[PDB]
């Protein structure tokens, strides 16, 4: 049921009723975004625009043709016009493809959306590519993680996240072709 | 007499030197903390692309946070978003609902605990001392989802430019309370998305809305920090202009008093010498 | 006796009664100030002798506003009743609008903020300021001044840019037919028979640019 | 905060209409209130010297001191503005000589030289018309 | 005994005694002639005795204007009905030599003292520029062979001024309500001729140049005008507490005049922004239109009763009118006219879209 | 209060007032050196807030009427 | 300064030339005339200058003019005491100045 | 202004001068600690502007 | 250094000093222009920090003890 | 405070013109050519008005 049409342009009239005319109408974050989800386009062939984001850095806003994401049900490739999805990512390697060239970032988790206008958005919290991570401290960190296991629920959830991330990072450092 | 105006001149002169130094300090802080504001603008795009933007929702509980500043030479920022806070809050409280008002920065706890005092539960400060990080904003969002409202209003000044700061409200609908209801369009608009999570959609939406609150809260306080620096850069220019204008008038006043002083002392000496000679 | 020196001189400027011929003498004493200090001794002596003042500001004279009349400080309370009617019909509204123009004077957006509802008073006070600018050795008859302030006040010049109001004024004086000047000079007031013909002749003028 | 002593000179200084005569008057009224309570030797006899004040103010002060009873212990020396310059010059010395009787006969006196800056002005006029050379602000040396 | 003048700042902050000496201190263009003309307009009509206007060293045009206004208003009658005139003018204006300006105040005092002493009347005595007596004595004193005193005046300033001003006294056989304009020479209140005059007066009304430059008329300095009538035992505790509260708010605003200038109002505390708002309301509310200023200002004058002034300033002190804007208080009569101006200020911003005025098919009517 | 001095100080006042007014003379000085920082209102550690919140009470205590001595 | 102006006036009136006249520090001309007036027992004017200040400057500056025979143009170095443009000596010098050439570091 | 702080004796620590303040007279320990006290007091007097 | 003039100037000084003190007076004038920034905590754009360290060491190089000329 | 980066080209044509204008006010003098090498230039009034 859609009997309550909320939104930015519906906020303006109620703001002109209950807030005074001394102030201009406040902005909304949908006024700064030129690209939406249902507004069709952006594919125009075999490429499709990717948006690899961390909270501290925009890693890519180029147009790729193949995106490999580490979903919680396993890895999956995103071609040009994928089905619209909301994929929770586990620790793994995101692989971008421009053709012969590739970017392989190892992420720490986060999400990945594919939208009905063919755009995709990869929303992680820390994405370090594989030359920035050392292979010497990942085994030290897993040995310091998978051995001391507290039976408390919070510490064992942290330990499960630790062994998952460090196992994926150990399986990702030597699996470069 | 004539020494108090000279010491007041010496006061306003180094007040003008102070404010001219503070303008360039705030300008360098605006230049350094602009690239982080430009980087953090990316991650707020896919969540308003996915969840939309619905400010005027009818809710049962709403945590409204007004992201103010820490130090207060910003000159019309922390009161302007207090005005915008009450202007966007009177718009969206006509359902008989509860409203929690929060302030990030301790120049908002001085301006919000007298206009809406009994609905003020939380005051956050010191978030700009070292820097703004995502773990800090995630902890602040964790104390925001201590209580479970149906909406999260974020009041902050969007750093549009070094001249213009548009105050921006951003809303986060909590998942099963409002987000699964505010997306129904002959069925739903979220059912076009194929959920590829471990558990059900009611939990991946919970994780997505907490992460969206953390993302836009981090971006909100980063934008508000850059607007603080860019408004202090203009307020200290106004203070240099005012303390140059006051100094220019007080210099003329001192010159008039100096001229009158030599004239009256000379007239006293002539009046003494004309009684004897 | 330096007050007596100027009071002896300036009390001889009077308007004589009808049993003394009815003649008059009008004085224009000129006092130069130092750095705009009008609280000086001789300045305040002649201010407390004369009827009004014409404060000429040194800040407006270098901003191109010539004659640099300080409209907030300069008064004339004896020739206020001795004003040309018609100029008394429009100039009271002119002085009121220049009074409420100095409520946003130099803090339009210079200090903190701009309203954009009082953009009209700024972009009208600039027109009333540029209307009153006038080049040297060219005095205007009063019937050609009241028509120019009529065009500036009633709203016939708001779409003219501020850079060309000095050309718009001479275009108004040149293009409006000279019968209205003779009617306003002879009748001594803008009659209700005259303001209709004046608004007719003021809507068919070719204001340059815009 | 500023505790007076019984033989101490205390200057009340300020601008015009800042309450200096009020402090001196309330001191005189309090000596009236204390003189009916102490045994005959801590009693304080006030002397008010009005230098250069107008006569309406002095008459209002006499009305105040009679309607409160303070005139039984108070002498008032009044050289007003209409008086000559040597009278206003000499009135603090007249009031001090009248108040020295209580000081020299074992009693305790209180003397208020109201407007001592007007006695200095009267002295300035008196000495300038004697053609003595003027000094700082044309005062005598 | 109080004398109500209808002026808000005068009746509130420094009320005038019924038989006392009143000073209007001013700095050449601040309005001590407009104020003394308004006191003539308000007080001398309600008075039952005779008025004596002494013009000492002022403009001759002002004396002719006062003569024509007093002939027109009927307080001066010519010809056979001259005995029903209630005013004597004594004029020694600034065209006269300094011997005439030095003794014309004494002529005005003699005419007033005959009505006070012999006739037993209650007299009004308005003296425009009592400074000119002192200035004329200083002009003749340089040629009498005296050594000058401080800044250039005669050595006998205080005794001449005292011998003049002590003749103006409410005695037991008659009263003189003296209103004397005093001129400060270069806006210097520390000049010896006004500083000597300050000690002779029961109620000073110090007009200021800066208050006039704000557009506030009458430009009375509220924190420099004093009166002996501002005492809770003579004018009641309500009026006194209201006047002291208004002075407290104005002094707290004057303490903040430097922070607001060099930093702006956004750095003030929330309790101090309320002080600044209430003070900017009460300092527009002290201003008032005058019946004698309506010829060159256009607005009609306002006579304000005393209870309306106390009732208005109670409401602005307690916070009853934080809704109304600051310009609603400016140049209005009482607290009713503040609300009836904030209506007209908000009808007018809604009168941006009322109609498009056009008068067509009219040229052959 | 920062400019009104007396030479005697002690040994010329009430011995009861001498015990009480020292804590007044000190705390008004604490109030005066704080109140020159009354443009910001940071209220440092509830100590600079407390000393003005006592000094304002002391200055309001010291007021009295006219022609009514105590 | 009157000596140098007379040497310029011969080139103005007799030669019929457009002569220049440079007065280095006209303030020192004012100061020397003030010292001459003070040594002659005259009562000083405002801030310490001579009572004859405007007329002692005008006796010099009015002879610097263009006539029908020639002209004297004068470039006078001006010192401003205590950087006060409202001091009587620069304020009286500025009533004769037709131009101003500011040289800055 | 020193006595307005309650400090007695109200000696100005900078404006007071002596001929004995000389390292060749009172010793290079006394002279250097007096110069250090005057240096830190002048530094605080320069900081008293930006503190307010 | 800002208020001390020499009208004879560089034409009557040591030529070994003339080539080295010319940089010194410009560095000291630049240090005087920026001397308000010296007591700030948030460090500036490192061009003013360079002159604020350089001039603050150059003013220490001009110190000299008494009765020992160099 | 900002740099040449944030100057508009509408506010950079003014810089590029005012710099060469304040260069073009400079001029070599004939009386200085005995120690500066470059000869002096006498500029007419019409040449000054045309060249500016
Ligand atoms: N403690 C007080 N409480 C209330 N009002 C006071 C107090 N003390 C003085 N006043 C008021 O201050 C006004 C001036 O008082 P007072 O005459 O004592 O000052 P003054 O300096 O002697 O004046 P002047 O300089 O004119 O002689 C009086 O009208 C009085 O009512
Ligand atoms: N109450 C008032 N309303 C309007 N204008 C006033 C008022 N009082 C003074 N003015 C203005 O200030 C000037 C004061 O002139 P005047 O009354 O002669 O004062 P003074 O005698 O001190 O020069 C007048 O020209 C008048 O325009
Ligand atoms: Mg007194
Ligand atoms: Mg007058």
CSV table of N, CA and C in Angstrom, one decimal, chain A residues 31-115:
chain,number,residue,atom,x,y,z
A,31,UNK,N,19.5,15.4,-3.2
A,31,UNK,CA,19.7,16.5,-4.1
A,31,UNK,C,21.1,16.6,-4.6
A,32,UNK,N,22.0,15.8,-4.1
A,32,UNK,CA,23.4,15.8,-4.5
A,32,UNK,C,23.8,14.6,-5.3
A,33,UNK,N,22.9,13.6,-5.5
A,33,UNK,CA,23.1,12.4,-6.2
A,33,UNK,C,22.5,12.4,-7.6
A,34,UNK,N,23.3,12.4,-8.6
A,34,UNK,CA,22.8,12.5,-10.0
A,34,UNK,C,22.3,11.1,-10.5
A,35,UNK,N,22.8,10.0,-9.8
A,35,UNK,CA,22.5,8.7,-10.3
A,35,UNK,C,21.5,8.0,-9.3
A,36,UNK,N,20.5,7.5,-9.8
A,36,UNK,CA,19.5,6.7,-9.0
A,36,UNK,C,19.5,5.3,-9.4
A,37,UNK,N,18.5,4.5,-8.8
A,37,UNK,CA,18.4,3.1,-9.0
A,37,UNK,C,17.5,2.6,-10.0
A,38,UNK,N,16.3,3.3,-10.1
A,38,UNK,CA,15.3,2.8,-11.0
A,38,UNK,C,15.3,3.6,-12.3
A,39,UNK,N,15.9,4.8,-12.3
A,39,UNK,CA,16.0,5.6,-13.6
A,39,UNK,C,16.9,5.0,-14.6
A,40,UNK,N,16.3,4.4,-15.6
A,40,UNK,CA,17.0,3.5,-16.5
A,40,UNK,C,18.1,4.2,-17.3
A,41,UNK,N,19.1,3.4,-17.7
A,41,UNK,CA,20.3,3.8,-18.5
A,41,UNK,C,21.6,3.3,-18.0
A,42,UNK,N,22.7,4.0,-18.3
A,42,UNK,CA,24.0,3.8,-17.7
A,42,UNK,C,24.7,2.5,-18.3
A,43,UNK,N,24.0,1.6,-19.0
A,43,UNK,CA,24.7,0.4,-19.5
A,43,UNK,C,25.3,0.6,-20.9
A,44,UNK,N,24.6,1.1,-21.9
A,44,UNK,CA,24.9,1.5,-23.2
A,44,UNK,C,25.9,0.5,-23.9
A,45,UNK,N,25.8,-0.8,-23.6
A,45,UNK,CA,26.7,-1.8,-24.2
A,45,UNK,C,27.1,-2.9,-23.3
A,46,UNK,N,28.4,-3.1,-23.2
A,46,UNK,CA,29.0,-4.2,-22.4
A,46,UNK,C,29.5,-3.8,-21.1
A,47,UNK,N,29.9,-2.5,-20.9
A,47,UNK,CA,30.3,-1.9,-19.7
A,47,UNK,C,29.1,-1.5,-18.8
A,48,UNK,N,29.4,-1.1,-17.6
A,48,UNK,CA,28.4,-0.7,-16.6
A,48,UNK,C,29.1,0.0,-15.5
A,49,UNK,N,28.6,1.1,-14.9
A,49,UNK,CA,29.4,1.9,-14.0
A,49,UNK,C,29.5,1.2,-12.6
A,50,UNK,N,30.7,1.2,-12.1
A,50,UNK,CA,30.9,0.6,-10.7
A,50,UNK,C,31.2,1.8,-9.8
A,51,UNK,N,31.0,1.5,-8.5
A,51,UNK,CA,31.2,2.5,-7.4
A,51,UNK,C,31.8,1.8,-6.2
A,52,UNK,N,33.1,1.7,-6.2
A,52,UNK,CA,33.8,1.1,-5.1
A,52,UNK,C,34.1,2.1,-4.0
A,53,UNK,N,33.5,2.0,-2.9
A,53,UNK,CA,33.6,3.0,-1.8
A,53,UNK,C,34.1,2.4,-0.5
A,54,UNK,N,34.9,3.2,0.1
A,54,UNK,CA,35.2,3.1,1.5
A,54,UNK,C,34.7,4.4,2.2
A,55,UNK,N,34.5,4.4,3.5
A,55,UNK,CA,34.2,5.7,4.1
A,55,UNK,C,35.2,6.8,4.0
A,56,UNK,N,36.5,6.4,3.8
A,56,UNK,CA,37.6,7.4,3.8
A,56,UNK,C,38.1,7.6,2.4
A,57,UNK,N,37.8,6.8,1.4
A,57,UNK,CA,38.4,7.0,0.1
A,57,UNK,C,37.4,6.4,-1.0
A,58,UNK,N,37.3,7.1,-2.1
A,58,UNK,CA,36.6,6.6,-3.3
A,58,UNK,C,37.6,5.8,-4.1
A,59,UNK,N,37.5,4.5,-4.2
A,59,UNK,CA,38.5,3.7,-4.9
A,59,UNK,C,38.3,3.6,-6.4
A,60,UNK,N,37.1,3.6,-6.9
A,60,UNK,CA,36.8,3.6,-8.3
A,60,UNK,C,35.4,4.1,-8.6
A,61,UNK,N,35.3,5.0,-9.6
A,61,UNK,CA,34.0,5.4,-10.2
A,61,UNK,C,34.1,5.2,-11.7
A,62,UNK,N,34.9,4.3,-12.2
A,62,UNK,CA,35.1,4.1,-13.6
A,62,UNK,C,34.0,3.1,-14.1
A,63,UNK,N,34.1,2.7,-15.3
A,63,UNK,CA,33.1,1.8,-15.9
A,63,UNK,C,33.8,0.5,-16.2
A,64,UNK,N,33.4,-0.6,-15.5
A,64,UNK,CA,34.0,-1.9,-15.7
A,64,UNK,C,33.0,-2.8,-16.5
A,65,UNK,N,33.5,-4.0,-16.9
A,65,UNK,CA,32.6,-5.0,-17.5
A,65,UNK,C,32.4,-6.2,-16.7
A,66,UNK,N,33.3,-6.5,-15.7
A,66,UNK,CA,33.2,-7.7,-14.9
A,66,UNK,C,33.6,-7.3,-13.5
A,67,UNK,N,32.8,-7.6,-12.5
A,67,UNK,CA,33.1,-7.4,-11.1
A,67,UNK,C,32.9,-8.7,-10.3
A,68,UNK,N,34.0,-9.1,-9.6
A,68,UNK,CA,33.9,-10.3,-8.8
A,68,UNK,C,33.8,-9.9,-7.3
A,69,UNK,N,32.7,-10.3,-6.7
A,69,UNK,CA,32.5,-9.9,-5.3
A,69,UNK,C,32.4,-11.1,-4.4
A,70,UNK,N,33.0,-11.0,-3.2
A,70,UNK,CA,32.9,-12.2,-2.2
A,70,UNK,C,31.7,-12.2,-1.3
A,71,UNK,N,30.6,-12.7,-1.9
A,71,UNK,CA,29.3,-12.8,-1.2
A,71,UNK,C,29.4,-13.9,-0.1
A,72,UNK,N,28.4,-13.8,0.8
A,72,UNK,CA,28.4,-14.8,1.9
A,72,UNK,C,28.0,-16.2,1.5
A,73,UNK,N,27.4,-16.3,0.3
A,73,UNK,CA,27.1,-17.6,-0.3
A,73,UNK,C,28.2,-18.0,-1.3
A,74,UNK,N,29.3,-17.2,-1.3
A,74,UNK,CA,30.4,-17.5,-2.2
A,74,UNK,C,30.6,-16.4,-3.2
A,75,UNK,N,31.7,-16.5,-3.9
A,75,UNK,CA,32.1,-15.5,-5.0
A,75,UNK,C,31.0,-15.5,-6.1
A,76,UNK,N,30.9,-14.4,-6.7
A,76,UNK,CA,30.0,-14.3,-7.9
A,76,UNK,C,30.4,-13.1,-8.7
A,77,UNK,N,30.3,-13.3,-10.0
A,77,UNK,CA,30.7,-12.3,-11.0
A,77,UNK,C,29.5,-11.4,-11.4
A,78,UNK,N,29.7,-10.1,-11.5
A,78,UNK,CA,28.7,-9.2,-12.0
A,78,UNK,C,29.1,-8.7,-13.4
A,79,UNK,N,28.3,-9.2,-14.4
A,79,UNK,CA,28.5,-8.7,-15.7
A,79,UNK,C,27.7,-7.5,-16.0
A,80,UNK,N,27.4,-7.1,-17.2
A,80,UNK,CA,26.9,-5.8,-17.6
A,80,UNK,C,25.6,-5.5,-17.0
A,81,UNK,N,24.5,-6.3,-17.3
A,81,UNK,CA,23.2,-6.0,-16.7
A,81,UNK,C,22.9,-7.2,-15.8
A,82,UNK,N,23.4,-7.2,-14.6
A,82,UNK,CA,23.1,-8.2,-13.6
A,82,UNK,C,21.7,-8.1,-13.1
A,83,UNK,N,21.2,-9.2,-12.5
A,83,UNK,CA,19.9,-9.1,-11.8
A,83,UNK,C,20.1,-8.1,-10.6
A,84,UNK,N,19.1,-7.3,-10.3
A,84,UNK,CA,19.2,-6.4,-9.1
A,84,UNK,C,19.3,-7.2,-7.8
A,85,UNK,N,20.4,-6.9,-7.1
A,85,UNK,CA,20.7,-7.7,-5.9
A,85,UNK,C,21.2,-6.8,-4.7
A,86,UNK,N,21.2,-7.3,-3.5
A,86,UNK,CA,21.8,-6.7,-2.4
A,86,UNK,C,22.6,-7.8,-1.7
A,87,UNK,N,23.9,-7.9,-2.0
A,87,UNK,CA,24.8,-9.0,-1.6
A,87,UNK,C,25.6,-8.5,-0.4
A,88,UNK,N,25.4,-9.2,0.7
A,88,UNK,CA,26.3,-9.0,1.9
A,88,UNK,C,27.6,-9.7,1.6
A,89,UNK,N,28.7,-8.9,1.7
A,89,UNK,CA,30.0,-9.4,1.4
A,89,UNK,C,30.7,-9.9,2.6
A,90,UNK,N,31.4,-11.1,2.5
A,90,UNK,CA,32.3,-11.5,3.6
A,90,UNK,C,33.7,-11.0,3.3
A,91,UNK,N,34.7,-11.2,4.2
A,91,UNK,CA,36.1,-10.9,3.8
A,91,UNK,C,36.5,-11.7,2.6
A,92,UNK,N,37.1,-11.0,1.6
A,92,UNK,CA,37.5,-11.6,0.4
A,92,UNK,C,38.1,-10.6,-0.5
A,93,UNK,N,38.3,-11.0,-1.8
A,93,UNK,CA,39.0,-10.1,-2.7
A,93,UNK,C,38.0,-9.7,-3.8
A,94,UNK,N,37.8,-8.4,-3.9
A,94,UNK,CA,37.0,-7.8,-4.9
A,94,UNK,C,37.9,-7.6,-6.1
A,95,UNK,N,37.5,-8.0,-7.3
A,95,UNK,CA,38.3,-8.0,-8.5
A,95,UNK,C,37.5,-7.2,-9.6
A,96,UNK,N,38.1,-6.1,-10.0
A,96,UNK,CA,37.5,-5.2,-11.0
A,96,UNK,C,38.2,-5.6,-12.4
A,97,UNK,N,37.4,-5.4,-13.5
A,97,UNK,CA,37.9,-5.8,-14.8
A,97,UNK,C,37.6,-4.7,-15.8
A,98,UNK,N,38.7,-4.2,-16.4
A,98,UNK,CA,38.5,-3.2,-17.5
A,98,UNK,C,38.8,-3.8,-18.8
A,99,UNK,N,39.1,-5.1,-18.9
A,99,UNK,CA,39.6,-5.8,-20.1
A,99,UNK,C,40.8,-6.6,-19.8
A,100,UNK,N,41.9,-6.4,-20.4
A,100,UNK,CA,43.2,-7.0,-20.0
A,100,UNK,C,43.7,-6.6,-18.6
A,101,UNK,N,43.3,-5.4,-18.1
A,101,UNK,CA,43.7,-4.9,-16.9
A,101,UNK,C,42.7,-5.2,-15.8
A,102,UNK,N,43.3,-5.4,-14.6
A,102,UNK,CA,42.5,-5.8,-13.4
A,102,UNK,C,43.0,-5.1,-12.2
A,103,UNK,N,42.0,-4.8,-11.3
A,103,UNK,CA,42.4,-4.3,-9.9
A,103,UNK,C,41.8,-5.3,-8.9
A,104,UNK,N,42.7,-5.8,-8.0
A,104,UNK,CA,42.3,-6.8,-7.0
A,104,UNK,C,42.5,-6.2,-5.6
A,105,UNK,N,41.4,-5.7,-5.0
A,105,UNK,CA,41.3,-5.2,-3.7
A,105,UNK,C,40.8,-6.3,-2.7
A,106,UNK,N,41.5,-6.5,-1.6
A,106,UNK,CA,41.0,-7.3,-0.6
A,106,UNK,C,40.2,-6.5,0.4
A,107,UNK,N,38.9,-6.8,0.6
A,107,UNK,CA,38.1,-6.0,1.5
A,107,UNK,C,37.9,-6.7,2.8
A,108,UNK,N,37.2,-6.1,3.7
A,108,UNK,CA,37.0,-6.6,5.1
A,108,UNK,C,35.6,-7.0,5.4
A,109,UNK,N,34.7,-6.9,4.4
A,109,UNK,CA,33.3,-7.1,4.7
A,109,UNK,C,32.5,-6.1,3.9
A,110,UNK,N,31.4,-5.7,4.4
A,110,UNK,CA,30.5,-4.7,3.8
A,110,UNK,C,29.5,-5.3,2.8
A,111,UNK,N,28.9,-4.4,2.0
A,111,UNK,CA,27.8,-4.8,1.1
A,111,UNK,C,28.2,-4.5,-0.3
A,112,UNK,N,27.3,-4.9,-1.2
A,112,UNK,CA,27.4,-4.7,-2.6
A,112,UNK,C,26.0,-4.7,-3.2
A,113,UNK,N,25.6,-3.6,-3.8
A,113,UNK,CA,24.3,-3.5,-4.4
A,113,UNK,C,24.4,-3.5,-6.0
A,114,UNK,N,23.5,-4.2,-6.6
A,114,UNK,CA,23.3,-4.0,-8.1
A,114,UNK,C,21.9,-3.5,-8.2
A,115,UNK,N,21.7,-2.4,-9.0
A,115,UNK,CA,20.5,-1.7,-9.1
A,115,UNK,C,19.8,-1.9,-10.4
